[PDB]
Amino acid sequence: PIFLNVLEAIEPGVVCAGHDNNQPDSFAALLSSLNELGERQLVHVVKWAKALPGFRNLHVDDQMAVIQYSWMGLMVFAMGWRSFTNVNSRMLYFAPDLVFNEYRMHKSRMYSQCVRMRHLSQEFGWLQITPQEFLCMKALLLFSIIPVDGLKNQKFFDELRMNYIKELDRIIACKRKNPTSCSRRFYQLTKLLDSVQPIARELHQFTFDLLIKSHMVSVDFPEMMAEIISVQVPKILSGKVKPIYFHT
Numbered sequence: 001p002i003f004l005n006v007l008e009a010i011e012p013g014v015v016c017a018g019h020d021n022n023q024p025d026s027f028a029a030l031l032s033s034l035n036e037l038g039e040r041q042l043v044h045v046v047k048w049a050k051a052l053p054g055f056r057n058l059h060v061d062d063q064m065a066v067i068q069y070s071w072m073g074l075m076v077f078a079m080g081w082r083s084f085t086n087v088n089s090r091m092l093y094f095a096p097d098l099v100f101n102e103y104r105m106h107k108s109r110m111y112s113q114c115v116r117m118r119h120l121s122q123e124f125g126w127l128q129i130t131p132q133e134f135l136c137m138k139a140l141l142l143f144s145i146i147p148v149d150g151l152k153n154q155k156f157f158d159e160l161r162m163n164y165i166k167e168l169d170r171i172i173a174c175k176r177k178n179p180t181s182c183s184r185r186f187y188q189l190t191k192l193l194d195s196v197q198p199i200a201r202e203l204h205q206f207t208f209d210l211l212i213k214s215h216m217v218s219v220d221f222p223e224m225m226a227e228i229i230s231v232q233v234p235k236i237l238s239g240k241v242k243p244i245y246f247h248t
């Protein structure tokens with residue numbers, strides 16, 4: 001398949017967080033690094049998204065927005081998958097140097113949101129998600145959140161999102177599936193995508209509050225990341241931009 005050649009051909013590489021595992025595990029130590037990973041992962045997502053099939057049909061002022069609104073979720077999705085394939089959903093494999101043990105889950109103060117992220121990671125296993133299904137879902141994921149008043153050129157956006165929903169269905173369907181089998185895996189796969197949204201929302205809020213009190217707690221925020229968290233994220237939380245759920 002052509003569409004799959006590119007998806008796999010573009011899948012990023014091992015991005016390291018550049019954490020100092022030697023020094024102890026302070027809350028600040030963790031997040032100042034998580035944030036740094038955010039930053040690093042952000043860049044790759046841009047190069048990934050931009051080199052996506054038909055991605056350039058979007059309006060210039062829509063390409064950037066689509067990516068920034070969707071980066072947490074995307075970072076979450078892939079991260080869940082790394083965890084799965086690597087530590088087998090036992091811990092959260094943020095990066096090779098930033099792997100989360102139960103201790104870290106609690107020291108980051110994100111224990112719970114992490115329970116959630118690890119939960120999603122387990123679905124790849126439980127549901128037996130396929131690398132081909134993962135890649136397709138990840139891509140669609142990007143086209144899963146937009147402003148209520150629509151983008152600059154909504155028509156291109158939706159057209160693009162339609163072609164993606166179909167690539168997903170084209171992959172899930174091509175084996176022992178038929179009727180109840182096809183109209184069951186699609187429900188779950190789309191049910192799995194919807195779940196990343198709630199998690200991203202809670203991560204958004206955490207990060208956002210974290211940026212405001214930033215100094216009070218001595219947590220590091222990169223130029224790039226901080227902007228998004230102050231300009232695009234507020235827009236999500238206030239309601240200006242909302243996710244796109246297949247269900248409910």
Ligand SMILES: Cc1c(N2C(=O)[C@@H]3[C@H](O)CCN3C2=O)ccc(C#N)c1Cl
Nearest residue numbers: 034035037038041075076079094095207
């Ligand atoms: C989710 C997340 C974050 N992440 C974020 O970007 C926000 C802020 O960094 C604060 C908490 N939170 C995170 O852990 C950073 C990097 C990666 C990767 N790889 C992921 Cl999956």
